[PDB]
Amino acid sequence: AKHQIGVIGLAVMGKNLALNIESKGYSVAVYNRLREKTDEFLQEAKGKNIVGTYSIEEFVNALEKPRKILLMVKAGAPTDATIEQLKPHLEKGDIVIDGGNTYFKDTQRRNKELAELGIHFIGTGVSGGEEGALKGPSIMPGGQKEAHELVRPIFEAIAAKVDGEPCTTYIGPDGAGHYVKMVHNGIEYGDMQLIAEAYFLLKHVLGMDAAELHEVFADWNKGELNSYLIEITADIFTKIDEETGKPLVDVILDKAGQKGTGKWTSQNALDLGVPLPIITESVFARFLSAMKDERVKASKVLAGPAVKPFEGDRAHFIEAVRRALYMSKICSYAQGFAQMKAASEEYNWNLRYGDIAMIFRGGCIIRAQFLQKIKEAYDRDPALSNLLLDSYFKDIVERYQDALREIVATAAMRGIPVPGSASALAYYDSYRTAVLPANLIQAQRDYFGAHTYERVDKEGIFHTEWL
Amino acid sequence: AKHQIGVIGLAVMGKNLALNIESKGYSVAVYNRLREKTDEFLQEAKGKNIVGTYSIEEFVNALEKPRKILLMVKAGAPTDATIEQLKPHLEKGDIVIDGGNTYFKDTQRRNKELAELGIHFIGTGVSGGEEGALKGPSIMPGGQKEAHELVRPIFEAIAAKVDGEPCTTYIGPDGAGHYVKMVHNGIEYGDMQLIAEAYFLLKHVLGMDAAELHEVFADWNKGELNSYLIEITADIFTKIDEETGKPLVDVILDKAGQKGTGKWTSQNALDLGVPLPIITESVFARFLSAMKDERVKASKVLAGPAVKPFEGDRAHFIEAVRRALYMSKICSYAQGFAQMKAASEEYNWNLRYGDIAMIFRGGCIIRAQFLQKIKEAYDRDPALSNLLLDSYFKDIVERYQDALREIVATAAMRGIPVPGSASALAYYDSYRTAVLPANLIQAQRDYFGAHTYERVDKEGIFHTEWLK
């Protein structure tokens, strides 16, 4: 018999997506190199319209033309080796979809190589984790338009929906979807760091235990901060470790891990020439936390300030931490969306930033009502160069900046590190400043490397003989 | 005949090095892919023991064996293309030296490829701008030790000297030299930002004009901040523009350019898992400065804080800025040398940090008295994991931290951007803190992604069914 779509790669992620697809009424053919994974899945999927296949050739010939193939294998060599194995069996107009957390430049290369053979390639971000894949992920496809239209109904049936809108859209050509999935990941790290900072601030300035941290974050999730990450943070602080009777979170080693994918947004921001301080500080902050042994060692030798207990208005401070968090979150998204814009211009993608905010509204980890406000900003002005300039975000920052300045000043004086929040404040004060101190930098570079400069008053290039 | 050393690539950097080599008694042959650069240089080099050659074969045949060839061409494809031109003609035991601003993995590759052929390869950082190349640069070579020994007298002859010692040493195997050169360049970016922030603070908090600013910086260069960058800064603040009667600095457009190599230290830190906040903020600050139009447009619509004029002790604030600047620089170097330690362990380079500190002492842009203190820290402890643990630097930061706190708080309250200095403080506060909020991050990661965590009280990898 002929099946509607094939999935290669049967880890939980691939299995759940194939289950999602089948529940939406499509017939699914599966293949996995490690034989046992297929055997297990077929027992897991009794009664469902999923068939196992046992070679690449069997798999390919079990599918309706034009063929739809979802790769969910290990990044790098195994993905390419599978694509290589598919090539002889596929025909002009067949569609290979890579759904892993792939570096967009890899997707660009595979797209280009397959195209020469008339085979289409879609690199797609899948967000939501393992449960999300089963129930409704965010899906971020990029590749040929003609190929996307063929697979679009499948994407649209399996994605999460907000207000009848599927959390999927055609992102753009080549590696656009994988690019946007990378930025999602970056933004995710920033949010987690900014929240970690709000926690540490409450813990140290106010001496808050887990139970009252629960209350605070639970309240926060009833307002503008409403989001999956805040939601789960409120719940984390309720958990009691049985063995010790301590809050579970206090027993967990403060050594933040990360996949090698974590650093990609920051590294790409550096290539494009776009400032991404908050997300980059967030990545560095994980690295510094992983240096736990160095840190406890330095704690016995390095002195902080000798500050007395906090005696100010406690309710005021809680709210100031909240507003500092929300403003910082805004600067981070402004930096992240400004990155996607530089990428769109550079790779010629014509990205729609309102559409991107729309797919982030559910399914994915950064999902929050917040993403609605971003969509609206781009609805109103598609070519908006920075989210800070939109009237909604502009109102917030003019009202919340006092709270962010107080938090930065207070953290500085009490010895509480707030790398993300501080760089958020510095970014805000740099972006709104017409004349920066880069005139001296420019003067210096000319002085020692005769790099030449431009002037404030005249047009054209200049070079002084300083020496 | 036969000349002692060859130079390929006659941009100003390669011409000056050749000139430099010649002035130390060596005979030099030169070649350039674009013929007119050679003709031009030869007009400039009459009086000098330098000859031009016009093919790669002629070039190679003009050199005494073992051949010593210095490559000063554009990075990437053109370097590789020149190496390819050279390969048919080189003989076993010949030495090619890439003095370009080369990514260290490229050097690693070229080193391997050339080694299989019996040809040695040295990738060398050369620092100090064009005047340094001419008068005395810092030379940071990496490669086969035996090959280095053969070029060592030439490096030592031309390098800058400080108190009789040349600013050059054997860095390590393969790409180690170009790696240290990269980090030097990262550190340079950080120092320039920290200074720019010092400037901007005095300018907006104290209302200093270019005359008061000059004073401050000249008075700083007589102290522990003594350095080339601070010296030229004190100088820059004296230049008046004739056709405006304005300080020239007030007339230069605030868009900081950068070479494509500028981002590399930060990108690599990300690869190695090392915290490099200050240098990276400095790269990003240059990117922000380049966005000049967005900033003017934004300046009309975005609100700053309400600020009364500054009322506190003015001499105190200048000293706080000075101290904030010195401490921040300490944190940046602490970060940058920690990155070198990481790369050394990763690539098995057995880096000698005191030696590196000593060759940064002259020739290169970041040259400063301060480097002696770094050298001494590694004398006391070669295996030192972070400079903040050394008694000199520990004592400085504990003394000056109060100043840095004041400057970060003041900047916040007054709307003055201090990205580099604020990240220095956050870094200090993070590094000295035994228990950071990453416990929450680990909880979150396990909650939504089953990533697992570790516990403070026992060994093992743990997962929680968070939903119940």
Ligand SMILES: O=C(O)[C@H](O)[C@@H](O)[C@H](O)[C@H](O)COP(=O)(O)O
């Ligand atoms: O749900 C998702 O969005 C994906 O599964 C994935 O993008 C993941 O969250 C990141 O790669 C970060 O994971 P770490 O926090 O483990 O680095």
Ligand SMILES: O=C(O)[C@H](O)[C@@H](O)[C@H](O)[C@H](O)COP(=O)(O)O
């Ligand atoms: O002296 C050096 O260090 C090098 O010859 C060279 O690498 C360069 O002068 C700097 O890297 C400046 O870089 P920018 O042009 O980016 O300021």
